[PDB]
Structure 1
Amino acid sequence: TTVTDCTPGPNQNGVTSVQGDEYRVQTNEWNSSAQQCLTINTATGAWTVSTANFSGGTGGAPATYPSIYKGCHWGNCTTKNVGMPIQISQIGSAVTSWSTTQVSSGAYDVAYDIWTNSTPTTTGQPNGTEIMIWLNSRGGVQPFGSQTATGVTVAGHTWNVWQGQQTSWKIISYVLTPGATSISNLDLKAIFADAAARGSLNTSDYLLDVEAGFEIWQGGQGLGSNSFSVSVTSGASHHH
């Protein structure tokens, strides 16, 4: 069925299990109490920002990051066919696809948020790397830190790379150039190898989760997720 979740931030997070709890959709209004509603299809995992009209500047922190994820966010973990936590260096393959709905108004990014951590579990802020993958953005926002590379080829696409330092973790943001509304079979293992070559990622870290959604500074109504998949593997074959 379809569920609507308007859980107000900044201190509450409304989390909805979709597709047999292979994915969770979170309101995650971590920096605002302004109205934000998500409408979520629990059979398909499709979701929309059905009500939002954020107000504020385009600099600094966004208001919110409503998102879908596989894995663990601040100890809230999916439970079907997860494949995480896993040491980065032990991944056989890691692939994701995301199809979005965008609006030509407001100030937002359309981004993956991928967390790594020194230990396989945490109840809070991961301490390794935050890997962001910006499919698109508008309204004057930019990534955290500084732009350190322009027009590089990684995992079959062209990016600008931004690197920064947070209070207890490193951030690297891959900005698809030009931006787009979807990406198909993105090789995250290739992104991790690149992030490690650029000095942003320790491949001994555990991959905790793969999230996708919208950091919103202004507006936000009508942004959505049409389809989302993440597959992280190896171990070994064994029909039993």
Structure 2
Amino acid sequence: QRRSDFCGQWDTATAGDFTLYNDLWGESAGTGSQCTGVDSYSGDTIAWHTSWSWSGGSSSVKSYVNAALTFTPTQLNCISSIPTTWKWSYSGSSIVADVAYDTFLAETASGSSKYEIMVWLAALGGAGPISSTGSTIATPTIAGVNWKLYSGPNGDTTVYSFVADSTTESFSGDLNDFFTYLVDNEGVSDELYLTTLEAGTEPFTGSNAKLTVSEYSISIE
């Protein structure tokens, strides 16, 4: 833990067009704490970290510390690409957590989400996504990675989660390829607005853990 870190439930920091949210929303489901800090911002690339220990509520996400892009909500129709690079590593013991993009689609620019679309670069310690059946709905290769695609409900929002077959500490590609996949193969409307582009980690449980994000960038064209 650094004295420069922020550890409050809803604390934020800003770097370029990113907001780094602590978003310790599942705090009450366990015992522990989580502190977060920006390390650098160079060009359009952010580097940051978050350290935590969480125990109890084994199946309950404790937080989603994430870097979120500020952008104008745009219809999938109007997106040419979403180039992104993400380099990270995890330290700690008994880590049950994911490292994932979290994105949302709505019928209007500032509307309620019809879909949540996740891209998991890591599923650590048995962490698993929302799934109606408990099995994949597809196993596509996208952005140089072999994925296991799952779907499941969260009330009025459908959650799609692409989970990498292997932990991917260095990822790069066009994130729009995932939206294009779902438009072509899972009946997602390309008239929907992309409202949210986030990249972070969901911890369940673990001790003396730290996500180091050495490089992250994303933009919409």
TM class, shorter-length: 0.7 to 0.9
Q: How many residues align?
A: 209
Q: For each residue in 1:187-238, what CA deviation from the matched residue of structure 2 results, as whole angstroms up to 9, or x when unmatched?
A: 22211111223326321111112111110001262112111111211xxxxx
For structure 2, which runs of at least 5 residues remain unmatched after alignment? none
Q: For each residue in 1:78-127, what CA deviation from the matched residue of structure 2 results, as whole angstroms up to 9, or x when unmatched?
A: xxxx3x310011111112111112126310001110111111014xxx42
Q: 2:110 corresponds to which residue? A: 121
Amino-acid identity (%): 27
User: Structure 2 CA distance, aligned partners of 1:163 and 1:199?
Assistant: 10
Match of 1:180 among 149, 168, 176: 168
Q: Indicate if the aligned counterparts of 2:86 and 2:171 stay in contact, CA closer than 8 A.
A: yes
**Match for 1:131: what amino acid?**
I
Q: What root-mean-square deviation, in Å, do the aligned CA atoms of Structure 1 and Structure 2 show?
A: 2.0
Q: 1:27 corresponds to which residue? A: 22
Deviation at 1:181, TM superposition (A): 1.0
Asked whether 1:17 is paired with 2:14, we answer yes
Matched residue SS, 2:8? coil
Deviation at 1:63, TM superposition (A): 0.7
Matched residue SS, 2:117? strand
Match of 1:208 among 187, 195, 198: 195
How do 1:52-201 and structure 2 match up within 5 A?
52-59=52-59, 61-71=60-70, 82=71, 84-103=72-91, 105=93, 106-122=95-111, 126-145=112-131, 146-149=134-137, 151-184=139-172, 186-199=173-186, 201=188
TM-score when normalising by structure 2: 0.86
Q: Which structure shows the higher strand fraction? A: 2
Q: For each residue in 1:165-203, what CA deviation from the matched residue of structure 2 results, as whole angstroms up to 9, or x when unmatched?
A: 11121111111112211202x122211111223326321
Q: Indicate if the aligned counterparts of 2:85 and 2:218 stay in contact, CA closer than 8 A.
A: yes
Q: For each residue in 1:21-40, what CA deviation from the matched residue of structure 2 results, as whole angstroms up to 9, or x when unmatched?
A: x1111100011154211122
Deviation at 1:150, TM superposition (A): 5.3
Q: 2:49 corresponds to which residue? A: 48
